[PDB]
Design an enzyme around this catalytic site. Structure first.
Site, short mmCIF file in Angstrom:
data_model
loop_
_atom_site.label_atom_id
_atom_site.label_comp_id
_atom_site.label_asym_id
_atom_site.label_seq_id
_atom_site.Cartn_x
_atom_site.Cartn_y
_atom_site.Cartn_z
N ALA A 167 0.75 -1.26 0.00
CA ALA A 167 0.00 0.00 0.00
C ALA A 167 0.78 1.31 0.00
O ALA A 167 0.33 2.29 -0.60
CB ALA A 167 -0.99 0.00 1.16
N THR A 178 11.94 -0.38 -0.27
CA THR A 178 12.71 -0.85 0.88
C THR A 178 13.19 -2.29 0.72
O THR A 178 12.94 -3.14 1.58
CB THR A 178 11.89 -0.73 2.19
OG1 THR A 178 10.69 -1.50 2.09
CG2 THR A 178 11.53 0.73 2.46
N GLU A 236 9.74 -10.77 4.04
CA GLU A 236 9.27 -9.89 2.97
C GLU A 236 10.40 -9.53 2.03
O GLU A 236 10.19 -9.40 0.82
CB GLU A 236 8.65 -8.62 3.55
CG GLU A 236 7.91 -7.80 2.50
CD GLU A 236 7.14 -6.66 3.12
OE1 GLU A 236 7.76 -5.63 3.44
OE2 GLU A 236 5.92 -6.80 3.29
N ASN A 281 3.87 -3.44 21.27
CA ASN A 281 4.13 -3.42 22.71
C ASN A 281 3.44 -4.58 23.43
O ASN A 281 3.94 -5.07 24.44
CB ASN A 281 3.65 -2.10 23.32
CG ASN A 281 3.77 -2.08 24.84
OD1 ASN A 281 4.88 -2.12 25.39
ND2 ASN A 281 2.63 -2.01 25.53
C1 LIG Z 1 6.71 5.93 3.37
C2 LIG Z 1 6.86 4.98 4.57
O1 LIG Z 1 7.90 4.97 5.21
N1 LIG Z 1 5.82 4.20 4.86
C3 LIG Z 1 5.80 3.22 6.00
C4 LIG Z 1 5.29 1.81 5.63
O2 LIG Z 1 6.22 1.23 4.74
C5 LIG Z 1 5.12 0.98 6.92
O3 LIG Z 1 4.61 -0.35 6.64
C6 LIG Z 1 5.52 -1.42 6.76
O4 LIG Z 1 6.31 -1.44 5.56
C7 LIG Z 1 7.30 -2.52 5.57
C8 LIG Z 1 8.09 -2.46 4.28
O5 LIG Z 1 8.67 -1.18 4.14
C9 LIG Z 1 6.58 -3.88 5.75
O6 LIG Z 1 5.70 -4.05 4.63
C10 LIG Z 1 5.78 -3.87 7.07
O7 LIG Z 1 5.08 -5.08 7.28
C11 LIG Z 1 4.76 -2.71 6.98
O8 LIG Z 1 3.99 -2.67 8.19
C12 LIG Z 1 4.13 1.66 7.88
C13 LIG Z 1 4.01 0.95 9.23
O9 LIG Z 1 2.80 0.20 9.29
O10 LIG Z 1 4.59 3.02 8.15
C14 LIG Z 1 4.76 3.85 6.97
O11 LIG Z 1 5.19 5.12 7.36
#
Ligand SMILES: CC(=O)N[C@@H]1[C@@H](O)[C@H](O[C@@H]2O[C@H](CO)[C@H](O)[C@H](O)[C@H]2O)[C@@H](CO)O[C@H]1O
Ligand SMILES: O=c1ccn([C@@H]2O[C@H](COP(=O)(O)OP(=O)(O)O)[C@@H](O)[C@H]2O)c(=O)[nH]1
Ligand SMILES: [Mn+2]
Length: 287
Positions: A167, A178, A236, A281
């Site tokens: 998303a 990432t 992932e 937490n």
């Molecule tokens: C733009 C940004 O930094 N967004 C992050 C989301 O990426 C983040 O979600 C996590 O993303 C990682 C991979 O990068 C993985 O998919 C984790 O399972 C997922 O939760 C989110 C936290 O929920 O914060 C946003 O800010």
């Protein structure tokens, strides 16, 4: 012989990516003809499987909501089998399932680190595929438990190998993804490479394809352990490396796994699944 044109119309969603360079469709709300697919699959009498892990407090916090929503929205109109993996069966919520839904529960060993609990899923799923899932379903989806179905998640999502667009990065450029960037890891993807950033919360395909997906991912996970390194985004990171080498035959839009924290932009027409707010937490016991 189902043909893409029979059920997929990319022109219905001109403002988003609907086709990959390798001709795989990216399923967005409006582009699919579920009626055509439901009839086609009903005639083949398919059965769809869904695996979900819940270890520790993930059970009390997310299992019931997940299963309750899955019962109502997942592959409605087709036989479905929920495979539930938990470390404590006595804490199994056992909800009432509707027509064409059934399940089976398995007791698994709880790994000490949540990172390993998440990664071991790859090994466990493969074992179950070989032992029984391959003989029980035509298609299988493997999902995180910390999310909830919001609307119909149907046959339009079925395919040989199915990946989910994360998303937060569906519109970003590859160099912002990432991906694991350390060459020492088996999940390494160098800048200048990559198609999309896939979410490990949802992936699937035929039992044969998922078996290979999980087997290859776990091989990379074990390899990293031998090289004293752990992928930044764990399973992932490995999943993304796998899908880079073995392109998915179908990709689901972020509508199939949306994070409401982002809000609800124009591209997200009808949410089929949403993330649960994080509660580390309480549900996690280690850093
Ligand atoms: C733009 C940004 O930094 N967004 C992050 C989301 O990426 C983040 O979600 C996590 O993303 C990682 C991979 O990068 C993985 O998919 C984790 O399972 C997922 O939760 C989110 C936290 O929920 O914060 C946003 O800010
Ligand atoms: O202690 C844990 C850690 C992970 N999981 C399972 O592994 C998935 C991946 O974990 P998590 O949802 O915490 O990952 P995130 O999406 O927040 O990165 C979870 O949905 C669960 O199905 C679990 O049951 N217990
Ligand atoms: Mn999750």
């Amino acid at each position: 012989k189902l043909k893409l044109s029979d059920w997929f119309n990319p022109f219905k969603r001109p403002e988003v990516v609907t086709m990959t360079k390798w001709k795989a469709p990216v399923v967005w709300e409006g582009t699919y003809n579920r009626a055509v697919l439901d009839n086609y699959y009903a005639k083949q009498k398919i059965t769809v499987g869904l695996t979900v892990f819940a270890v520790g407090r993930y059970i009390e916090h997310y299992l019931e909501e997940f299963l309750t929503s899955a019962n109502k929205h997942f592959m409605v109109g087709h036989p479905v089998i929920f495979y539930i993996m938990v470390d404590d069966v006595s804490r199994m919520p056992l909800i009432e399932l509707g027509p064409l839904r059934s399940f089976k529960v398995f007791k698994i060993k709880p790994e000490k680190r949540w990172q390993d609990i998440s990664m071991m899923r790859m090994k466990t799923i493969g074992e179950h595929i070989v032992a029984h899932i391959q003989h029980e379903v035509d298609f299988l989806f493997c999902m995180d438990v910390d999310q909830v179905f919001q609307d119909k998640f149907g046959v339009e999502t079925l395919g040989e190998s199915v990946a989910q667009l994360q998303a937060w990065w569906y519109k970003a450029d590859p160099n912002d993804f990432t991906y694991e960037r350390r060459k020492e890891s088996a999940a390494y993807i160098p800048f200048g490479e990559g198609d999309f950033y896939y979410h490990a919360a949802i992936f699937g395909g035929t039992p044969t394809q998922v078996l290979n997906i999980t087997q290859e991912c776990f091989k990379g996970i074990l390899k990293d352990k031998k090289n004293d390194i752990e992928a930044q985004y764990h399973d992932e990171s490995h999943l993304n490396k796998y899908f880079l080498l073995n392109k998915p035959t179908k990709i689901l839009s972020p509508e199939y796994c949306w994070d409401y924290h982002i809000g609800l932009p124009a591209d997200i027409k009808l949410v089929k699944m949403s993330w649960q707010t994080k509660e580390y937490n309480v549900v996690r016991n280690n850093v």
